A paper describes a structure:
One of the key enzymes within this node is phosphoenolpyruvate carboxykinase (Pck), which catalyzes the interconversion of phosphoenolpyruvate (PEP) and oxaloacetate (OAA) using ATP or GTP as a cofactor and a divalent cation as an activator. Like human cytosolic Pck, Mtb Pck consists of two domains: the N-terminal domain containing 337 residues (residues Ile1 to Glu241 and small subdomain comprising residues Val310 to Gln406) and a slightly smaller C-terminal or mononucleotide-binding domain of 264 residues (residues Gly242 to Ala309 and Gly407 to Gly604).
The final dataset was collected to 1.8 Å resolution for Pck-GDP-Mn2+ and to 2.6 Å resolution for Pck-GDP complex, respectively. However, only one tightly bound Mn2+ ion was found in our model based on the coordination geometry and refined B factors in the presence of 0.1 mM Mn2+ in the crystallization solution. The Mn2+ coordination sphere is formed by four water molecules, oxygen from the GDP phosphoryl group (O3B), and OG1 oxygen atoms of Thr276. These hydrogen bonds, together with an additional water molecule, form the octahedral environment of Mn2+ in metal binding site 2 of Mtb Pck. Calculations revealed that Mtb Pck binds Mn2+ with dissociation constant KD = 6.25 ± 3.25 μM and a stoichiometry of binding m = 1.14 ± 0.06, which indicates relatively strong interaction of one Mn2+ ion with one protein molecule. These data support the results from our X-ray structure, which indicate that only one Mn2+ ion is coordinated in an Mtb Pck metal binding site. Structures of Pck-GDP-Mn2+ and Pck-GDP complexes are very similar, the Cα root-mean-square deviation (RMSD) is 0.363 Å. Comparison of Mtb Pck-GDP and Pck-GDP-Mn2 complex structures indicated that binding of Mn2+ does not influence positioning of GDP in the active site during anaplerotic reactions.
Numbering used by the authors: 6 to 606
The structure:
């Protein structure tokens, strides 16, 4: 195809693969992306010409755009996401599995001719800092320009990644199509997609095949498909960890930095914590990431984290100058693509929770929206901003260092109205794994439906594991067993969402979570107490710095209470979950569960 002839690499495996894909999908032309600022502008000008992008008032925003999607293509589709390992047991009970030969036959049928009437982009990229010994590289082939521009922000895309591949370097093969072939002469739509959607991962060959969605983690294949699904399977095989964790640098009033990694499920506070503004005099906070952490042991035996991503793909609604000024400042520097937010009368963007009460807006469907009248949200409730990390004012200077940052503490947490204390320190590594493995959160989904349950979401990875959950637990246990336990991060479990009898929050959270992290630091520095309980070490209210905090000590005590009775009721929920994990549940997790049972009596 034209002009693969004119392509800036001698990597023959790449060229072949591009040719084989093009022969199948039959695009009008193939274009290799270089990631320059020039190309970005051209792509964006095209997308504006197509009507997919609206340019935002340049007086208010530097080089920014609003994109609106088809309302059928508005989120990740977990019921259409598949781990297609050779054996169903290697996908495991948390994944949808399909026999790989079966899946290939479905997807090859779907891909045949699917790019008719479009450009096929070949997008090389790097996950992690460019300057690594063996960086993790990929190529995404896509027929969406939206995808290319988003990939440019969310990954290290283009010329530099293509050069790192050399002539025979390995890379992850990622194929994407929106699945909306055009007939000759046919007018295209602003957001092409298909009613048939598949997001498929082949862990053994390290390939991702996506079809039919233009949106988010369905289409930006670095963001979840590579960074967690494929990466988790590589990490399992190569001796490291790919996780759903923010990375936070906390700096004490003396001049000491502590790095923490925290795994909360979506909607449980990762973005807030990752951009924490501490409330205790002299403490500062910087971010390395609010989503993905890749972690590996160094020569000295410590665990080092790196963010593989290069941008933030944040949920917009709720974001404002009070809730997250640092997120706001990042967006204010421009170079941002908003997806599915509302457009103001002066060509700015708005969404629910932002300052102002615009009386009229154009909503994310392109319809007129009116204050105290229009029954639908102006911004889609899961709309996004896509912005460069380098614009974040509290970004840590080590954010682009390939050797990463040494982790002191790993935090697990989710939303629990009852039972789980504000903070608890694990007893050892194995116990740590167990706390992670049984993380519970009170949240449910539209097509889960019912309602008040406690979802189990092991390390915050329920939708993202690239292999059997039991073998993942084992992998965590093994990394601990084979390490020097003095160099290992300590493990904590937090809960910001415990409620009193009248149902208010016992803990105020947000900035004040800096006080919980201070206890954690103090435990690392042998400066704070905590009582041994059935579920781990938990501070008394006296062990915590509440100086300056306008809250009832009775509330804090209640937020910290470990009640044997509540915990006994938790045990059959946990038991059901561990039975679900099935035959690959490790003995180590069952042993911890037996220990927990013994201590609760
Ligand atoms: N009560 C309470 N709510 C919080 C806290 N941190 C975040 N939230 C809320 O939980 C939701 C999710 O926060 P976000 O930080 O975007 O979580 P993410 O999806 O994991 O990034 C938002 O409605 C936040 O206001 C906290 O410490 N306490
Ligand atoms: Mn977030």
């Amino acid at each position: 195809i034209p002009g693969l002839d004119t392509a800036p690499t001698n990597h023959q495996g790449l060229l072949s693969w591009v040719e084989e894909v093009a022969e199948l999908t039959q695009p009008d032309r193939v274009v290799f992306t270089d990631g320059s600022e020039e190309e970005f502008q051209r792509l964006c000008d095209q997308l504006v010409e197509a009507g997919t992008f609206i340019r935002l008032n340049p007086e208010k925003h530097k080089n920014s755009y609003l994109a609106l999607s088809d309302p059928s293509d508005v989120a990740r589709v977990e019921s259409r996401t598949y781990i297609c390992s050779a054996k169903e047991i290697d996908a495991g009970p948390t994944n949808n599995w399909m026999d790989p030969g079966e899946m290939r036959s479905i997807m090859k049928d779907l891909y045949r001719g699917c790019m008719r009437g479009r450009t096929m982009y070949v997008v090389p990229f790097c996950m992690g800092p460019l300057g690594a010994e063996d960086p993790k590289l990929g190529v995404e082939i896509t027929d969406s320009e939206y995808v290319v521009v988003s990939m440019r922000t969310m990954t290290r895309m283009g010329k530099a990644a293509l050069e790192k591949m050399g002539d025979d370097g390995f890379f992850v093969k990622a194929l994407h199509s929106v699945g909306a072939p055009l007939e000759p002469g046919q007018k295209d739509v602003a957001w092409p997609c298909s009613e048939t959607k598949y997001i498929t991962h082949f862990p053994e060959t390290r390939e991702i095949w996506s079809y039919g969605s233009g949106y988010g983690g369905n289409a930006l294949l670095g963001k979840k498909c590579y960074s967690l699904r494929i990466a988790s399977a590589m990490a399992h095989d190569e001796g490291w960890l790919a996780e759903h964790m923010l990375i936070l640098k906390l700096i004490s009033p003396e001049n000491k930095a502590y790095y923490f990694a925290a795994a909360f499920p979506s909607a449980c506070g990762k973005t807030n914590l990752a951009m924490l503004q501490p409330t205790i005099p002299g403490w500062r906070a910087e971010t390395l990431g609010d989503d993905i952490a890749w972690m590996r042991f160094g020569k000295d035996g410590r665990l080092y984290a790196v963010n593989p991503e290069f941008g933030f793909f944040g949920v917009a609604p709720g974001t404002n100058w009070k809730s997250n000024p640092n997120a706001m400042r990042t967006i204010a520097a421009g170079n941002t693509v908003f997806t599915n937010v509302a457009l103001t009368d002066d060509g700015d963007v708005w969404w629910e929770g932002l300052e102002g009460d615009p009386q009229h807006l154009i909503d994310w469907k392109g319809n007129d929206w009116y204050f105290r009248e229009t029954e639908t949200n102006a911004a889609h409730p899961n709309s996004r901003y896509c912005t460069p990390m380098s614009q974040c004012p509290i970004l840590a200077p080590e954010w682009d260092d390939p050797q990463g940052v040494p982790i002191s503490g790993i935090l697990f947490g989710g939303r629990r109205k009852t039972t789980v204390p504000l903070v608890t320190e694990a007893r050892d590594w194995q116990h740590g794994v167990f706390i992670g493995a049984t993380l519970g959160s009170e949240q449910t989904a539209a097509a889960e439906g019912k309602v008040g349950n406690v979802r189990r979401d092991p390390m915050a990875m329920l939708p993202f594991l690239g292999y059997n959950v039991g073998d993942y637990f084992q992998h965590w246990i093994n990394l601990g067993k084979h390490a020097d336990e003095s160099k290992l991060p300590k493990v904590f479990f937090v809960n910001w969402f415990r409620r009193g009898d009248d149902g208010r929050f016992l803990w105020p959270g947000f900035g004040e979570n800096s006080r919980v992290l201070k206890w954690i630091v103090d435990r690392i520095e042998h400066k704070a107490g905590g009582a041994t309980t059935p579920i781990g070490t938990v501070p008394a209210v006296e062990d915590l710095d509440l100086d300056g905090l306008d809250v009832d000590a009775a509330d804090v005590a209640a937020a910290l209470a470990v009640d044997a009775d509540e915990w006994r009721q938790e045990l059959p929920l946990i038991e059901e979950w561990l039975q679900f994990v099935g035959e690959k549940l490790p003995t180590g997790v069952k042993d911890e569960f037996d220990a927990l049972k013994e201590r609760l009596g």
